[PDB]
Symmetry: C5
Subunit: 312 residues, 5 copies
């Protein structure tokens, strides 16, 4: 119907609130995720009032196309949401209530740079379409924003779900619009990653350091190359759960470091053998005895430097 009359110079205020039911399917490559949630609205129009004399229970008719309903759009969504309108009720002064339910696929950036121990913020963006007579502004109702205890994400824990009360007023296509921001803070559960990825890798790296305790060329070659193939196959196994990231990550830095260490180990085995065939066993013995201590200390220092550069 017609919008509220412009006699009340105050912008029509719509108290919004989103109530989460469950968040599922947090895709990392497309950086999307689907949601299922309620959506509340409330606004006051003294042009449709309710006389107390009809009833004391505040008779609140469900009016289709008999009332002016402000319509809400989501910004970062691939498709329009699947709204299911439940009930609309009118107060005796005309403070009309509202209730819906939707499912949507949201687009939000992710940052996989602390990947195993990272934390994300997800955003949902709400605008309201202007009207000719009156004005509409958006406002947050703290008693309606919440989440169910049935909201589970596979792998994540949910910290907070708040809504910045300040709209970001701007002009677009020669039109002024207001925006609302809903933030969802989640942290990744990282205990399973240690015994699943980290410790077997370090076991395989430590196996190839037992070649500094031997003088047999063939055994040392077998050891280092076979462990290198092992590491390649473990990388193949790990990559299946790693989201494809066209940038730099702590895990890939570690993997490059392991690659480098493997190369240097092969170099040292070759140098020991070449020296020993040239009839200089003292120099080879010294070099292998040096390397025994040299390799782990350097590995530890490099790992400390990388954890300082990434998590500091």
């Amino acid at each position: 119907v017609s919008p509220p009359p412009p006699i009340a110079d105050e912008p029509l205020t719509v108290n919004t609130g989103i109530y989460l039911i469950e968040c599922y399917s947090l895709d990392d490559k497309a950086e999307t995720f689907k949601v299922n949630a309620f959506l509340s609205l409330s606004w006051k129009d003294r042009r449709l009032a309710f006389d107390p004399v009809r009833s004391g229970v505040r008779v609140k008719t469900y009016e289709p196309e008999a009332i002016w309903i402000p319509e809400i759009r989501f910004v970062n969504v691939e498709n329009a949401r699947d709204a299911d309108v439940v009930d609309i009720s009118v107060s005796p002064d005309g403070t009309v209530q509202y209730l819906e339910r939707f499912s949507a696929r949201v687009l939000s950036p992710l940052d996989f740079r602390r990947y195993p121990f990272d934390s994300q913020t997800l955003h949902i963006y709400l605008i309201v379409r202007s009207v000719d007579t009156r004005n509409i502004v958006l406002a947050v109702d703290l008693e309606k924003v919440g989440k169910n205890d049935d909201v589970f994400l596979t792998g994540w824990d949910i910290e907070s779900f708040t809504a910045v009360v300040k709209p970001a007023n701007f002009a677009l296509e020669d039109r002024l619009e207001s925006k609302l921001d809903y933030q969802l803070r989640i942290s990744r559960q990282y205990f399973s990653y240690i015994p699943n990825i980290i410790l077997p890798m370090l076991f395989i790296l430590f196996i190839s350091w037992t070649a500094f305790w031997s003088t047999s060329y063939e055994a040392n070659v077998t050891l280092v190359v076979s462990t290198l193939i092992a590491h390649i196959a473990f990388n193949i196994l790990v990559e299946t759960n790693l989201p494809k990231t066209p940038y730099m990550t702590y895990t890939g830095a570690i993997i490059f470091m392991i690659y480098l260490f493997y190369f240097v180990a092969v170099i040292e085995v070759t140098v020991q053998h070449y020296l020993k065939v040239e009839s200089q066993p003292a120099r080879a013995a010294s070099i292998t005895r040096a390397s025994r201590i040299a390799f782990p200390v350097v590995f530890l220092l490099a790992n400390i430097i990388l954890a300082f550069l990434f998590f500091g």
Copy 2:
């Protein structure tokens, strides 16, 4: 049309019943599953009655938009269901019957912590939307809840399909609502997993223990590292059917244990060789003879301790 008159102070009772046709596509990563089932309803409204004088067969007209039909929503569903209305019939006292058919994609948590020998419970959640004049409460009709013998799940057996008769009355968005809970208990068929995963793994582990019966360094290195690569490739093969779980599982504990045993075996081979090159064959002989018995007993005890900690 108009809801039943509030003269009968009793809440309008709706006897519900779900009748399963088939459950298919039990996804483990998204923890969803699709269903196909009937849905029955029955309720009594003396405002639309049927005179016995019209017919003795209880003439039961199919009324579209001529009758007040209570509408049912599912809670843990990604999209609204695909309802196909079959037939509505009116009794002579106004006890109206109802019949539909739907397909839906349900969200329900799974717990893959006893993974090979686990058992799940699946939930379907039903609410009824309130009405202004009268009240509606939900009730379960035991003669309509059942499953077809054509309900197959790939890999699972079906134990029971019941419906808790107690609604979970609560208030949401300033509205009181009732809920119904349908539980489906399924158990996983675990015989195929033994000869498919467990026994070849133990064969590969037992092959690398034949190095305690040898004094040849090169052969022992070949044996242990090649079996280790074998184990890595078997893990790569197994992971393709394992749902990705960001938590702790019995199977992954076993795999970590195998990794540890491999590391310790490599350590012992290196220690034997180092001792033997230093001209101390008695000590190496004792250590290998100890290890022969030591490794299987420790493996058995660790496996017993893990099966006690997980299945007890």
Copy 3:
């Protein structure tokens, strides 16, 4: 419109016939398959007749919502079909004809227990919704059931496509209903599986039996373990086309058997070496000479016993 008058006490008979165009996408994990087919119907109602005096060509009007059309539902389908109504024609005595076209995704169990040389039966299930005045029963028209020569399934040949003329009358939800069964018998083309899976596997198994012709420990260890890794990678390659089956199959029995034989071969190599180091070459020689003949005979007998237990 109104159903046929109950004056003719005979149930309204609907001659059905399904005519296949193509069957595509035979999924094995979901055990579904999509179809594309015509659907014919014919029924006689003397309440809408056609006077011969209007025309001698039996004027047959296309009546939308002017005629009582019995509606047909499929039982084992994920979603309702995509019906495209072509033409409806009325005979001079009221024997009305019918013609549609649909595409559907059908759910039907498969049994992958003779997997390489198995044969399946696919089912499509048809019910008719009752009516108040008259009765409807279902009947099969042999002149309309057929398949196009353009029906191809990737990998399968089509034997027969018949329709059991006997309905399975039963009562459901306090309603009696009739059912029709359409069966499609298909057999799997198994020639490509031999040179693709079977013969290379037997080649790899025969390669590791050349260690009974050698006395070199290192060569024998290399041979058996490297072939074992080979077998693991071939299993990885084969599993990509094998549908995931949570039960017992002939192929997996063969694979378990190969695993066992590999274990026993490693045991025998270790026993020969241990005996030879203990200064007992006669016993080792006898054992290897025994094994040369012993291994293939046992393999043949086990394979015969398995083919008898699975295909008999």
Copy 4:
């Protein structure tokens, strides 16, 4: 509206033409492919004419439900197409024009038997639904059949796009119908397959023939088995782009041949070693010297025989 009057005994002729925009997503397993194309129609009905006195520009009204439009169906399509009607125009003698645009998913068989150097023909099938008064026959308009220079298929070149002008008149479900056939000839670009698949395979095969130049058992075993594993992993890598084909292909014949050659090489190494240990070096030397020349000639002859049997 009503069909054209049967006074003109001539069947209503509809000049059809399909104009390609782009062909994308040529799936090989499902043997489908999607298309995007225009669709033209033209037919003459003197029952709706246009007087020259209204305008000399041949006023051509866009008539919805004011004109009899013949409707066109596609036969080998999974779903109905997405028709977007652009414009309908009427000529002064009633030769009405027509224009649409559709996207469709077409089912068409493929034959992957010359796989690397094969050529396909794709078919689109058009029927017209009969009418009661007049008759409709189909006819091809050569000035409307074409393709855009923006039609790209990933990997294929497009040779021709023609339309057999002869309908295949037949009777189906007691109804006579006409069919139109549109053929699209495509050839596969095969240069990238040589350096990507063929040459590295031949390199790996040639590496294992360097064992005929050695007398060291351990080195020869390492060489042949390690190359065999290499070949298995290369097969694993190649299979990812090969469509799954349940039949016989040139490539798989080559692969089986390589498997056989590997087996025979292992046999010859074992025979040389066995002969040499038995104190008969002359016979072993002769056999290895024979094999050096024998293996490549046999490989060449087998490859020639296979290319003659498959491409001749």
Copy 5:
């Protein structure tokens, strides 16, 4: 309604502008990508004017089916877009404004021939359907073409987004039409590819060149073949992110080159051993000393020649 009157001989000009929100899901195999964007339109019709006397705020009614709206189609799209009409406003001289929002899946060719360091241009194509009375031509509004700072593509940076102001006027299906071209220039972020693909490959290649520093046949065979398997598995790992390209690429040329170098290394090891067994150690020593320097220089020169032939 009726189109603008042909009295103004000037073609109706429609100022278009596309405003990007986000570009996601840049598929490389299908060469598609989805978009989400606004779409502006503006055109002047003095047949619907607005009297200044009604209001000074230029009363601008939202007219559904009361105004002649020119309709816009996209050419290279799989399906029609998901238009959501926001608001239409009329100026006092009849310069009507327009505003929509759509999501679409666009087809555009890609050229993966400089793959790691390539740059693409994406196209969106707009036509306008002619009208009988007046003419419509298309024109670009520079104040409406833009992109949000929230437009992210996973892996790419966005350079420019412009619109060629010149239409490509042509005649199709006996109709003249105008076209608009929107170009989006993107460049690929290539830093992560070096430490992820390039350096480990060169490490593995350098490891196998340590065999020119040894005279032990068995060790040299182990080294070269094991590194070759390593390279095969690294290729298997790399191919998972490489789009399937049926043509020639810089990366595949590099990989073929590595394959060739591996073959030549095996040849040289065999030649050294054969010479040394024939009692000619001076010639073998010279050949290995030559190869030490010969291999890297040749590798560098070949890489320079390939980077000149591909990026020049």
